[PDB]
Amino acid sequence: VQSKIGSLDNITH
Amino acid sequence: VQSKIGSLDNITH
Amino acid sequence: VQSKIGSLDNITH
Amino acid sequence: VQSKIGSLDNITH
Amino acid sequence: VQSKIGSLDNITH
Amino acid sequence: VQSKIGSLDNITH
Amino acid sequence: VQSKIGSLDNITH
Amino acid sequence: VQSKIGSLDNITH
Amino acid sequence: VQSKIGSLDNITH
Amino acid sequence: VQSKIGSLDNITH
Amino acid sequence: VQSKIGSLDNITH
Amino acid sequence: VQSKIGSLDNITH
Amino acid sequence: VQSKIGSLDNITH
Amino acid sequence: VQSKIGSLDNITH
Amino acid sequence: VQSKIGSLDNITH
Amino acid sequence: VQSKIGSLDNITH
Amino acid sequence: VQSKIGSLDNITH
Amino acid sequence: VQSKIGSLDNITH
Amino acid sequence: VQSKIGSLDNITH
Amino acid sequence: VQSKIGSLDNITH
Amino acid sequence: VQSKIGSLDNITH
Amino acid sequence: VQSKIGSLDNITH
Amino acid sequence: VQSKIGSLDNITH
Amino acid sequence: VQSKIGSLDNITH
């Protein structure tokens, strides 16, 4: 509700 | 409800 | 509710 | 679950 | 589930 | 669960 | 009852 | 009852 | 009852 | 069995 | 069994 | 069994 | 079972 | 079981 | 069981 | 179950 | 079940 | 269960 | 209900 | 209810 | 209820 | 459900 | 559920 | 549930 997910998994390989 | 997903998996390989 | 997740796992390999 | 009730009964006299 | 009730009964006299 | 009740009965006389 | 309601599931293998 | 309701499922293999 | 309600599950393998 | 399961009842007299 | 399970009842007289 | 489980009852006289 | 009803109602006006 | 009802109501006006 | 009811109500006006 | 088993009802109005 | 089994009903108006 | 078993009801109005 | 079992097994040996 | 069991097993040996 | 067991096992040996 | 309700079973072996 | 309700069982071995 | 309610069991061995 009225929320934001910027990211969950930011993997740099 | 009135929410935003910018991204879930941002993989840089 | 009215919350934000910037990130959960930031892995640099 | 992630719901909302603005009102149920709006009675005027 | 992710629903909304704006009102149920709007009664005026 | 992550819900909200703004009001149930709004009665005026 | 024995449900998956209003949830998010992210799985990276 | 034994349902998947209002959910998101992201799977990356 | 025996449900997954309003939850987030992130799994990285 | 003879239940009101996940229902909405609105009765106005 | 003869229950009100996850329901909403609104009765106005 | 003959219970009110996770329900909302609103009664206005 | 092996019973007798002589009468039930004897009403006189 | 092996019983008798002579009468139940004897009403006179 | 092996019982008798002579009468229950004997009302006179 | 919720029955009228081997009973006698006498109603006078 | 929800039956009238071996019963006697006498109604007088 | 919730029955009227082997009982007698006499009602006079 | 209002029944009777005279016998079930009559074994002579 | 209002019943009677005369016998169940009558064994002669 | 209002019943009677004369006997259950009548064994002669 | 998977019950013996109002039944009679006689087994002789 | 998986019950003996209002039943009679006679077993002879 | 997995009960003997209002029943009769006679076992002869």
Method: cryo-EM
Q: How far apart are CA X8 and CA W9, in angstroms?
A: 6
Q: Apex CA L9: angle with CA D10 and CA D4, to 5°?
A: 60
Nearest CA-CA partner of H8 in B7, B3, G4: G4
Residue-by-residue DSSP string for D1-13 = ---EE--SEEEE-
User: Exposure pattern of L1-13 as b/e (b: 16+ CB <10 Å)?
Assistant: eeeeeebbebeee
Nearest CA-CA partner of V3 in X4, M4, N11, L6: X4
Yes or no: say if P6 and R5 are a contact pair by the CB < 8 Å rule: yes
Whether L11 sits inside 8 A of K6 (CB atoms) is no
- What amino acid is encoded at V9 in this protein? D
Q: Which residue in chain H has the smallest CA separation from E2?
A: H6
The residue written with tokens 């019982």 in the block is O3
CB atoms within 10 A of CB D8: 23
- Which chain B residues touch G6 with a CB distance below 8 Å? none
3-state helix, strand, coil in chain M (%, to 5): 0, 45, 55
- For residue R3, report the phi and psi dihedrals to the nearest 5 degrees: -115, 170
Q: How far apart are CA L8 and CA L10, in angstroms?
A: 7
- For residue S5, report the phi and psi dihedrals to the nearest 5 degrees: -105, 110
Whether U11 sits inside 8 A of X10 (CB atoms) is no
Provide the shortest C-alpha distance from residue T7 to chain P (in Å).
23
Q: Is the dihedral of CA H12, H9, G7, K5 positive or negative?
A: negative
- What amino acid is encoded at C10 in this protein? N
The residue written with tokens 């109500």 in the block is O9
Whether D8 sits inside 8 A of E13 (CB atoms) is no
Resolution in angstroms comes to 2.9
- What amino acid is encoded at I12 in this protein? T
Distance of CA O2 to the CA centre of its chain: 15
Which of residues 1 through 13 in chain B touch H, CB cutoff 8 A?
Answer: 8-9, 11
Q: How far apart are CA M7 and CA N8, in angstroms?
A: 7
Whether X5 sits inside 8 A of W1 (CB atoms) is no
- Which chain C residues touch I10 with a CB distance below 8 Å? 8-9
Q: How far apart are CA E11 and CA L12, in angstroms?
A: 13
Residue L6 corresponds to which tokens in the numbers above? 């996770």
Residue-by-residue DSSP string for chain B = ---EE--SEEEE-
CB pairs under 8 A between K and L: 39
Residue R13 corresponds to which tokens in the numbers above? 């109005």
